[PDB]
């Protein structure tokens with residue numbers, strides 16, 4: 443399906459061999475620090491190690507989500523975490539940020555991939571940062587409103603607008619990944635419709651990452667709280683893989699890695 | 712999709728509303744009994760109650776699987792269990808047997824559905840029993856050999872041979888359910904191919920039940936023992952539902968009911 447691998451500097455990810463698991467780093471800050479304090483960084487490193495041991499392929503690290511923080515404060519949180527994880531855990535790191543300056547400092551600190559929940563629309567200079575460092579960037583579907591004329595047609599148009607911003611900044615096709623933004627600017631009903639129709643995104647010709655883990659729409663369907671959503675997350679991961687996604691972004695790496703390996707064997711990936 | 716409901720005597724199962732969950736009753740016999748002894752029956756009733764509370768729609772009960780047993784001995788085991796479950800748990804019961812006489816006595820004891828792992832081929836009179844009591848019968852794909860010319864084409868031919876045996880005995884179309892027999896007369900590789908192609912079975916025009924729970928092919932893929940196959944079972948259940956199956960036969964009812972409910976919401980069932 444893919445005639446290239448994802449080049450992540452010292453690491454390379456094959457897009458044809460298996461579904462790639464992105465583990466969500468828990469990044470809980472210490473209350474009396476703005477810092478790369480031992481407790482907060484050590485906890486993050488331990489968590490990165492555990493996700494690696496349970497089958498993660500990428501570690502996703504962010505700096506907001508928790509005391510309110512300015513850009514300078516966000517960088518001071520995320521940089522020490524990227525530095526320590528990048529030294530201690532041999533996996534590529536994605537930086538979860540929509541801000542150009544955070545992206546830039548995170549890459550300088552050791553991050554390999556930019557993960558942007560606003561798809562280069564909140565701060566278009568992030569695509570300039572991406573193009574310059576020659577890193578993959580994930581362009582997620584998101585909007586400041588839910589006024590769809592036609593959900594899937596509109597998602598694809600919106601994503602194409604993100605692709606144009608990136609390509610116009612010099613991002614190469616091989617460095618673009620798309621994501622439907624499940625749970626962003628969508629009703630519960632719309633998140634289900636997007637899942638049901640996820641294979642449409644494949645027409646744009648880029649790899650697709652799916653983020654559904656523990657999201658409210660699963661709670662809407664099952665009437666279950668956040669800590670009781672493993673089975674529902676699982677269903678979303680399996681459907682996403684059947685519909686052709688190359689990556690899943692998940693909290694529960696052990697369980698979802700197993701589900702994904704089984705799905706891969708069945709579909710012939 | 713279906714213009715009829717499954718009529719199960721006092722119970723009715725709708726085939727359009729949700730994926731139907733068949734819970735596998737654990738049926739462990741007491742060693743010094745041939746009997747409906749208290750320990751063995753009480754344990755079965757407790758297990759049926761738990762599966763009901765966790766979302767099961769049907770309870771599957773068998774008499775072999777454990778001391779060796781003749782037909783008379785198999786009936787003496789299963790009848791007391793069917794009697795007690797049928798009195799205490801308000802769900803339809805399927806009798807897991809390929810033997811005409813067991814089926815007949817089980818229905819007399821209160822069973823609603825015949826679940827036949829040999830698809831009326833081991834004892835064709837079982838279809839006569841089915842037609843007479845006007846009960847649904849599950850015709851599973853099975854063979855005494857793995858010599859396929861072409862796996863899916865051969866499974867469909869084999870299943871059609873089962874359908875012909877049932878219809879020739881007077882079984883009505885509305886009382887036929889098919890099952891691909893995952894883990895029967897198939898290599899691990901063939902069980903994966905069958906999963907990947909399960910939607911072909913839908914051309915025959917009958918509802919489909921999928922049984923994958925905890926099976927060796929999942930162990931083959933994940934290199935995990937029987938008690939560590941929940942995530943793999945889950946993947947198989949999700950793929951089966953996406954490929955249009957109406958029932959799943961499972962050990963872990965809580966977890967698989969949740970997965971199935973989420974899948975149903977996504978696919979628009």
Ligand SMILES: CNc1nc(N)[nH]c(=O)c1[N+](=O)[O-]
Pocket residue numbers: 538557558559580582621623624625651652653654691
């Ligand atoms: C950084 N956060 C995310 N990133 C991507 N790419 N997709 C998501 O669904 C989410 N998410 O749900 O939070």
Ligand SMILES: CNc1nc(N)[nH]c(=O)c1[N+](=O)[O-]
Pocket residue numbers: 807826827828849851890892893894920921922923960
């Ligand atoms: C009674 N046992 C079964 N019955 C059906 N219908 N399908 C199965 O896969 C199995 N099974 O795997 O054991």
